[PDB]
Design a protein around this ligand. Structure first.
Ligand SMILES: [Cl-]
Ligand SMILES: [Cl-]
Ligand SMILES: [Cl-]
Ligand SMILES: [Cl-]
Ligand SMILES: [Cl-]
Ligand SMILES: [Cl-]
Ligand code: NA
Ligand code: NA
Lengths: 73, 374
């Protein structure tokens, strides 16, 4: 549907998405809203890392709130 | 179980010495305007007046008993002031038996006085040993006790926030998370930012102050949008019950003394039931308890609603059920009527009238139809 992301700056974007997507494209959408390159994004929800699967795979659902932290090369 | 029995004796002791020996708390309200007239009369009163012996009258009515009228007044009153119709409270998302403060309450410009009013009414129910006709979340009772909200309490109010905050506590945020002691939320189509502490906008969240951050942010997410309303209610409540009288109570105990017993035991029910024109071994009576045994908790709440006006019972349970004049046990009355009728209730008498239905299934189905929700 339309999931949200609580980022490490406290920013709480709204992200137009779909379960037909995969979190790589999510990172691109995050690269869209605030321009954080995918390779320094690390996405958490259910206390667990999201390996580069779809939202409709990780038991993610509509109108949800992931936590975007900083992956740190 | 015992410890609660001792805590309640101690509370009753101390409430007793807080009550003045002389004087009365006098209320005279019409039944059609119980809410607004109770509000004007109670808010004229000083805290100290609220501890006096209750002396309530319904306009144009002589009561059977001052204690009884008082019992009725709080039940009828609390049913009005909590009804979401008047804008102060609303049903919680997943449960209609649980009320929450309405964030949008200020459309009533005088709304804080009404929350203050509600606090005093809840406190008077505790102080004088009556019950409120409604129910709140456990975190609400917890905030009413002055306790802080655990993080565990988030697992229902916000699983997604609960998990994020958990992850912050479990892992090292150094270099990974640039959060601040200030939080933002969606208020009226808009984003508004709120410091969790003085100058929190300028205070980084780090590994050292993480625990403080999550504690302040849980406490805030419960009060979010309802803070002034809770404060006003809590003032009214502590004007009647000083906060130190409830030091030793937890949230589940406060809920029992304010609202009574929510868990309905069928055996306590069976045993404190009177039978009119039927016997313990008659079919209508066996089938009724068979149906009550199958009824889940929601269904049992509605059946009790239907026959008594309340989905809750006193702490002492069903032996303590009150009717109009003093106590009246639950009563099953088998009546001589057409077997297509539904059971009819007489809530002044805690009596249900049942036709001599021909099968368990007919009674089961007709009972469920009678107790349908309004
Ligand atoms: Cl008067
Ligand atoms: Cl009294
Ligand atoms: Cl009287
Ligand atoms: Cl019979
Ligand atoms: Cl009682
Ligand atoms: Cl008839
Ligand atoms: Na007393
Ligand atoms: Na009168």
């Amino acid at each position: 549907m339309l999931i949200f992301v609580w980022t490490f700056k406290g920013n709480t974007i709204t992200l137009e998405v779909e379960p037909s997507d995969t979190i790589e494209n999510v990172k691109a959408k995050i690269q869209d809203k605030e321009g954080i390159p995918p390779d320094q994004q690390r996405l958490i929800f259910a206390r667990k890392q999201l390996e580069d699967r779809t939202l409709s795979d990780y038991n993610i659902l509509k109108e949800s709130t992931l936590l975007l932290v900083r992956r740190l090369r | 179980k015992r410890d609660l029995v001792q805590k309640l004796k101690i509370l009753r002791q101390e409430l007793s010495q807080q009550q003045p020996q002389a004087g009365h708390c006098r209320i005279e309200v019409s039944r059609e305007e119980i809410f607004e007239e109770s509000y004007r009369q109670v808010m004229k009163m000083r805290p100290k007046d609220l501890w006096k012996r209750l002396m309530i009258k319904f306009r144009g009515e002589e009561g059977l008993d001052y204690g009884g009228v008082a019992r009725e007044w709080l039940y009828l009153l609390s049913h009005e002031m909590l009804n979401p119709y008047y804008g102060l409270f609303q049903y919680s998302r997943d449960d209609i038996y649980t009320l929450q403060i309405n964030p949008d309450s200020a459309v009533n410009p005088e709304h804080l006085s009404y929350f203050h009013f509600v606090g005093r009414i809840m406190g008077m129910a505790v102080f004088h040993g009556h019950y409120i006709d409604g129910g709140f979340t456990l975190p609400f009772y917890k905030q009413l006790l002055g306790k802080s909200i655990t993080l565990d309490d988030m697992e229902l109010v916000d699983p997604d926030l609960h998990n994020s905050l958990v992850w912050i506590l479990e892992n090292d945020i150094t270099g990974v998370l640039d959060h601040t002691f200030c939080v933002e939320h969606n208020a009226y189509g808009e984003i508004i930012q709120h410091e969790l502490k003085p100058n929190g906008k300028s205070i980084p969240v780090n590994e050292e102050n993480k625990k403080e951050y999550v504690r302040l942010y849980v406490n805030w997410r419960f009060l979010r949008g309802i803070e002034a309303q809770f404060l006003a209610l809590q003032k009214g409540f502590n004007e009647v019950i000083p906060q130190h009288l409830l030091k030793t109570f937890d949230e589940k105990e406060l809920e029992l003394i304010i609202c009574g017993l929510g868990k309905i035991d069928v055996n306590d029910w069976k045993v404190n039931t009177r039978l009119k024109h039927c016997t313990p071994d008659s079919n209508i009576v066996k089938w009724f308890w068979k149906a009550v045994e199958f009824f889940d908790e929601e269904r049992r709440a509605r059946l009790l609603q239907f026959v008594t006006g309340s989905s809750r019972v006193p702490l002492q349970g069903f032996k303590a059920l009150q009717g109009a004049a003093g106590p009246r046990l639950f009563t099953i009355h088998q009546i001589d009527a057409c077997t297509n009728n539904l059971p009819k209730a007489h809530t002044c008498f805690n009596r249900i009238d049942i036709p001599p239905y021909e099968s368990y299934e007919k009674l089961y189905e007709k009972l469920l139809t009678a107790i349908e929700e309004t």
